Amino acid sequence: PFTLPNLPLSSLSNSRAPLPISSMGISPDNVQSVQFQNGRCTLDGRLVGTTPVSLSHVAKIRGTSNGTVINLTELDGTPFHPFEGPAPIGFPDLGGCDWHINMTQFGHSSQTQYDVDTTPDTFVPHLGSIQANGIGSGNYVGVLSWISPPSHPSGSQVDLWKIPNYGSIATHLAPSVYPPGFGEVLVFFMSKMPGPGAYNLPCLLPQEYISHLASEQAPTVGEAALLHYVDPDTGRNLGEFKAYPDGFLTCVPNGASSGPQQLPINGVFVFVSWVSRFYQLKPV
């Protein structure tokens, strides 16, 4: 029926950058809902936001610099239009930080580091343009390399739970994700992101979970999916979790000892059955 990848978490990838998943976590005290644009897929198999099927499209950009601006296109080279979304499919969605994209060219040698500040009004990927920060004329394909603290919210710290400013504060943003409540906490898959700090990138689903869900457009019954996080070596059930139709998991923490982050990351999520949205999970 409905299925999730029968693969160990630590072997999967983040969905907002091509990084391996290192642990599971929760949002900080000051984050209730999130609105990531990448790593968004319904249990139905419907890609949301700028989420691509393949990790080979994640946190990447493509376009032509005329010396002052870079006109964006799909990674494909086919045109991008505002009505389609906040930015081209795959566009980085890491807010609260400056980006450093590695730029390459088909037909040309070498690479160039592209420093991106997502706060000026020259940064408008929704309208198909972003400031060329010294990147000279030519066609480029870039991938997020490493990040750093924001240049203009002067002195501010890296905050990856945020999303960048796509439009020039209606960019057709994917709806934001809200915790169901009543004891249930949203689970995030974390990864370490290169840069001058101990940066941790969260995402709602592992990228392979997305390609798998988009592949298995399973007629998802039930308002919520009861899953077991199991150790593939012992078959031991390490705790119950829930998967909602919008494409996110939750669980119930155990007060102090905590929950998700305590669990080892070599486990596998297994679909046990369709339950009601109001089903109660045993702690973890």
Ligand X SMILES: CC(=O)N[C@H]1[C@@H](O[C@H]2[C@@H](O)[C@@H](CO)O[C@@H](O)[C@@H]2O[C@@H]2O[C@@H](C)[C@@H](O)[C@@H](O)[C@@H]2O)O[C@H](CO)[C@H](O)[C@@H]1O
Ligand Y SMILES: CC(=O)N[C@H]1[C@@H](O[C@@H]2[C@@H](O)[C@@H](CO)O[C@@H](O)[C@@H]2O[C@@H]2O[C@@H](C)[C@@H](O)[C@@H](O)[C@@H]2O)O[C@H](CO)[C@H](O)[C@@H]1O
Contacts with ligand X, residue ranges (CB under 6 A): 98, 109, 115, 117, 148-149, 151
Residues 6+ apart with CB under 8 A from 132: 65, 66, 67, 68, 69, 70
Partner from ligand Y, a second copy, ligand X, none contacting 42, C-beta within 5 to 8 A by type:
none
Determine which helix (DSSP H) or strand (DSSP E) holds 62, and give its type and residue range.
strand 60-65
Strand partners, 250: 186, 242
Total site size for ligand Y, rule CB under 6 A: 6
- Which residue number, 127 or 218, has a Cβ lying nearer to a second copy? 218
**Min dist. Cβ of residue 151 to ligand Y (A):** 3
> Is 157 in contact with 148 (CB distance < 8 Å)?
no
Residues 121-140 binding ligand Y (CB under 6 A) are none
**Min dist. Cβ of residue 181 to a second copy (A):** 32
DSSP 30: T
Among 16, 61, 98, 251, binds ligand Y (CB under 6 A): 98
Position of tokens 């389609």? Answer: 84
Dihedrals φ, ψ of 216, to 5°? -95, 80
Q: How many CB atoms lie within 10 A of CB 120?
A: 13
Residues forming the site for a second copy (CB under 8 A) = 5-8, 11-14, 18-20, 52-57, 75-76, 100, 102, 104-111, 113, 141, 143, 145-146, 148, 191-192, 194-198, 207-208, 211-212, 214-217
**Min dist. Cβ of residue 92 to ligand X (A):** 14
